[PDB]
Design an enzyme around this catalytic site. Structure first.
Site, PDB file in Angstrom:
ATOM      1  CD  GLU A 164      -0.348  -1.825   2.788  1.00  0.00           C
ATOM      2  OE1 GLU A 164       0.575  -2.424   2.187  1.00  0.00           O
ATOM      3  OE2 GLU A 164      -1.119  -2.400   3.597  1.00  0.00           O
ATOM      4  CG  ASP A 206       0.338  -2.719   6.989  1.00  0.00           C
ATOM      5  OD1 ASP A 206       1.436  -3.204   6.630  1.00  0.00           O
ATOM      6  OD2 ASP A 206       0.143  -1.492   7.145  1.00  0.00           O
ATOM      7  CG  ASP A 220      -4.786  -3.598  10.141  1.00  0.00           C
ATOM      8  OD1 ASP A 220      -4.639  -3.742   8.906  1.00  0.00           O
ATOM      9  OD2 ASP A 220      -4.844  -2.474  10.690  1.00  0.00           O
ATOM     10  CD  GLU A 233      -6.673   0.428   7.595  1.00  0.00           C
ATOM     11  OE1 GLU A 233      -7.522   1.229   7.151  1.00  0.00           O
ATOM     12  OE2 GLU A 233      -5.728   0.790   8.334  1.00  0.00           O
ATOM     13  CE1 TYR A 286       0.375  -2.968  10.624  1.00  0.00           C
ATOM     14  CE2 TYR A 286      -1.031  -4.386  11.975  1.00  0.00           C
ATOM     15  CZ  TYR A 286      -0.886  -3.406  10.996  1.00  0.00           C
ATOM     16  OH  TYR A 286      -1.986  -2.849  10.392  1.00  0.00           O
ATOM     17  NE  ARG A 316      -3.516   0.855  12.557  1.00  0.00           N
ATOM     18  CZ  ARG A 316      -4.330   1.191  11.556  1.00  0.00           C
ATOM     19  NH1 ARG A 316      -4.851   0.255  10.772  1.00  0.00           N
ATOM     20  NH2 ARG A 316      -4.634   2.465  11.342  1.00  0.00           N
ATOM     21  CG  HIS A 376      -1.619 -10.692  16.288  1.00  0.00           C
ATOM     22  ND1 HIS A 376      -1.561 -10.550  14.918  1.00  0.00           N
ATOM     23  CD2 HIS A 376      -2.929 -10.856  16.595  1.00  0.00           C
ATOM     24  CE1 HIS A 376      -2.781 -10.625  14.418  1.00  0.00           C
ATOM     25  NE2 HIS A 376      -3.630 -10.809  15.414  1.00  0.00           N
TER      26      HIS A 376
HETATM   27  C1  LIG Z   1      -7.627  -2.695  10.196  1.00  0.00           C
HETATM   28  C2  LIG Z   1      -8.301  -2.819  11.442  1.00  0.00           C
HETATM   29  C3  LIG Z   1      -8.150  -3.959  12.234  1.00  0.00           C
HETATM   30  N1  LIG Z   1      -8.775  -4.081  13.417  1.00  0.00           N
HETATM   31  C4  LIG Z   1      -8.485  -5.356  14.110  1.00  0.00           C
HETATM   32  C5  LIG Z   1      -9.114  -5.941  15.372  1.00  0.00           C
HETATM   33  C6  LIG Z   1      -8.497  -7.341  15.488  1.00  0.00           C
HETATM   34  O1  LIG Z   1      -7.943  -7.510  16.783  1.00  0.00           O
HETATM   35  C7  LIG Z   1      -7.319  -7.340  14.479  1.00  0.00           C
HETATM   36  C8  LIG Z   1      -7.031  -8.685  13.767  1.00  0.00           C
HETATM   37  O2  LIG Z   1      -7.887  -9.753  14.379  1.00  0.00           O
HETATM   38  P1  LIG Z   1      -8.228 -11.124  13.736  1.00  0.00           P
HETATM   39  O3  LIG Z   1      -6.998 -11.883  13.509  1.00  0.00           O
HETATM   40  O4  LIG Z   1      -9.113 -11.821  14.736  1.00  0.00           O
HETATM   41  O5  LIG Z   1      -8.948 -10.894  12.491  1.00  0.00           O
HETATM   42  O6  LIG Z   1      -7.686  -6.368  13.456  1.00  0.00           O
HETATM   43  C9  LIG Z   1      -9.627  -3.083  13.950  1.00  0.00           C
HETATM   44  O7  LIG Z   1     -10.200  -3.168  15.010  1.00  0.00           O
HETATM   45  N2  LIG Z   1      -9.768  -1.948  13.144  1.00  0.00           N
HETATM   46  C10 LIG Z   1      -9.154  -1.745  11.907  1.00  0.00           C
HETATM   47  O8  LIG Z   1      -9.332  -0.704  11.266  1.00  0.00           O
END
Ligand SMILES: Cc1cn([C@H]2C[C@H](O)[C@@H](COP(=O)(O)O)O2)c(=O)[nH]c1=O
Length: 558
Positions: free
Chosen positions: A8, A88, A90, A92, A296, A298, A334
């Site tokens: 990105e 990335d 996450d 989004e 990362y 986040r 993570h």
């Molecule tokens: C990109 C993005 C990710 N997230 C998150 C929350 C989750 O803890 C993380 C990835 O979790 P997951 O592996 O269970 O899908 O991404 C948001 O809350 N807001 C956002 O804008």
């Protein structure tokens, strides 16, 4: 022939280019490519780009000027065997990856979705070694979030203009965050300081050394006078008492290093230690990350990989020694935010400004420190008797610095039980209770996490997005609630109870996690959300005499 890899941003492309062979062609989409604009009404549906009445059908559109960028990708796609989506990790990021795959078209077999939490030679290798597939559930979770946010914003706002004032805004979580500040404001405004006193005593050991004590008890009951006379009364009694060491206790204590950073803790530390705001910290963090210097930024996981822990333990051993290296690694529960290479010091960073280096230093120190042994101290507690009074003295001596060794460089006398002390002076001091502290951007995030409201990926946005809206303002690095901020908060609280409720908001987050883990279907989750929302919104529109939202008026004396 060659493979296509999409990221990105340019900076991310350059760094990852350093670890991808000749068969790979890296290209940065440079942005979002496609996204959303800017009892149903076509007018509302177009502005939103989502249709709550036709099962959440969306209308995405390529961004301005991004049209030529699209065609350029399609070309690279037709001359490449496989396409790798390296956005990335996450949600989004998953969505951005999805938009890319939609726009470029082609067989799903042509696509792969790589995942990595740091851009290093070794990390990029395992990433393209065992590539995975686009996770549609993470995508569905990300869109559900965007959809409900959009619905609250474009549907509650029009009501606010009609009832309160033109230009106002509403935010699903934003309003909830504003509520916390509004309640804190009100607490402070209503606080009434309280007077309470303390008494200290200057004494002498037999040898003649100075010993400072504070009065703790009178009649075996805690000592806490509340006025001037109560103190003088106790002061003159203490002036005649015979003082003696009624008890001594020497106990060894320790202090453990903190766990490695995560989004929330990092921001608080950056704000507390370096005076960096949430926006500042997150922008430098991302900049260091895309540069390949840290993991990362986040995350809410304090875990560390085996290699990361082994590389750091080696560093502690070579640069500090046996007594600083714990028997076994410290396990926190993570990956956390940590340096990518413990051997790269803040002073060795290239493309980074001073503050981005300070942040790295902070991240580095925390990481190294969390894997070092604890500091050892020898605490001393002297209890002194005097008539019906009991006084106390505290003292601590460092015996082994341990983990504090990586942080910047920075005493009770000798007395045995039964020794007599000589009174030299009595010093009374008046104090007063303080009101609750104001939120800081970081502290507010801290509060939000405590209540399970944000997510490592929305904290910064939440914080920024509630500013310049006329509801809350930052003054001297602290939050202040504006009147309009209280006006809108009471209205929403009276006519949108469920939406403003802290538990319901946190539950939505759980709700969203469930969609991502295939424990819930996104449209169903949106329908339930819309159902509760429109029932709230309908009553809100009614005249206040029927239970609708109150207008920001003030009738005459008629
Ligand atoms: C990109 C993005 C990710 N997230 C998150 C929350 C989750 O803890 C993380 C990835 O979790 P997951 O592996 O269970 O899908 O991404 C948001 O809350 N807001 C956002 O804008």
């Amino acid at each position: 022939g060659k493979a296509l890899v999409i990221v990105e941003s340019p900076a991310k492309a350059k760094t990852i280019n350093k670890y991808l062979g000749s068969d790979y062609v890296v290209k940065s989409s440079v942005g979002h490519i496609r996204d959303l604009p800017t009892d149903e009404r076509g007018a509302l549906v177009n502005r939103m780009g989502v249709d709550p009445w036709h099962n959440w059908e969306a209308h995405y559109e390529v961004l301005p000027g991004k049209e030529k960028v699209v065609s350029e990708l399609k070309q690279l796609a037709e001359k490449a065997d496989h396409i790798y989506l390296a956005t990335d990790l996450d949600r989004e990021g998953e969505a951005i990856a999805w938009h890319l795959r939609e726009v470029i078209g082609g067989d799903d077999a042509r696509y792969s979705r790589v995942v990595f939490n740091e851009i290093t030679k070794n990390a990029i290798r395992q990433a393209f070694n065992k590539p995975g597939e686009l996770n549609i559930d993470r995508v569905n979770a990300q869109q559900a979030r965007r959809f409900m946010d959009r619905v609250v914003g474009y549907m509650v706002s029009p009501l606010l203009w009609k009832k309160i004032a033109r230009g106002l805004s509403a935010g699903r979580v934003q309003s909830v965050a504003v509520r916390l500040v509004v309640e804190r404001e009100r607490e402070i405004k209503a606080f009434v300081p309280e007077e309470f006193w303390e008494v200290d005593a200057s004494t002498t050991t037999p040898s003649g050394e100075a010993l400072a004590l504070q009065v703790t008890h009178q009649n075996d009951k805690p000592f806490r006078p509340v006025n001037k006379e109560q103190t003088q009364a106790a002061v003159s009694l203490l002036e005649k008492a015979r003082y003696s060491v009624l008890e001594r206790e020497d106990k060894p204590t320790t202090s453990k290093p903190g766990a490695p950073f995560i989004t929330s803790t990092l921001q608080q530390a950056a704000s507390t230690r370096l005076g960096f705001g949430v926006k500042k910290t997150m922008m430098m963090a991302q900049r260091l990350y895309e540069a390949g210097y840290i993991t990362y930024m986040r995350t809410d996981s304090t875990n560390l990989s085996q290699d990361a822990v082994n590389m750091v333990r080696g560093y502690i051993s070579d640069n500090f020694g046996k007594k600083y290296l714990p028997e076994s690694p410290n396990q926190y529960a993570h990956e956390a935010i940590r340096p990518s290479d413990v051997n790269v010091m803040a002073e060795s960073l290239k493309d980074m400004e001073a503050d981005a280096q300070k942040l790295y230093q902070l991240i580095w120190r925390q990481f190294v420190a969390c894997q070092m042994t604890p500091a050892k101290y020898d605490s001393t507690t002297l209890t002194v008797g005097a008539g019906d009074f009991r006084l106390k003295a505290r003292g601590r001596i460092l015996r082994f610095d341990g983990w504090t060794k990586v942080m910047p460089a920075l005493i009770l006398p000798a007395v045995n039980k039964g020794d007599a002390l000589t009174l030299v002076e009595l010093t009374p001091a008046q104090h007063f209770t303080k009101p609750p502290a104001r939120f800081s951007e970081a502290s507010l995030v801290k509060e939000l996490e405590k209540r399970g409201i944000g997510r490592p990926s929305t904290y910064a946005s939440i914080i920024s997005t509630i500013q310049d809206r006329g509801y809350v303002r930052v003054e001297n690095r602290r939050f202040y609630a504006e009147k309009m901020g209280e006006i809108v908060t009471d209205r929403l609280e009276e006519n949108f109870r469920e939406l403003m409720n802290y538990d319901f908001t946190a539950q939505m987050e759980n709700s969203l996690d469930q969609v991502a883990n295939h424990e819930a279907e996104w449209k169903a989750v949106l329908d339930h959300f819309f159902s509760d929302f429109t029932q709230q919104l309908d009553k809100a529109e009614k005249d206040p005499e029927e239970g609708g939202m109150r207008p920001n008026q003030m009738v005459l004396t008629s």
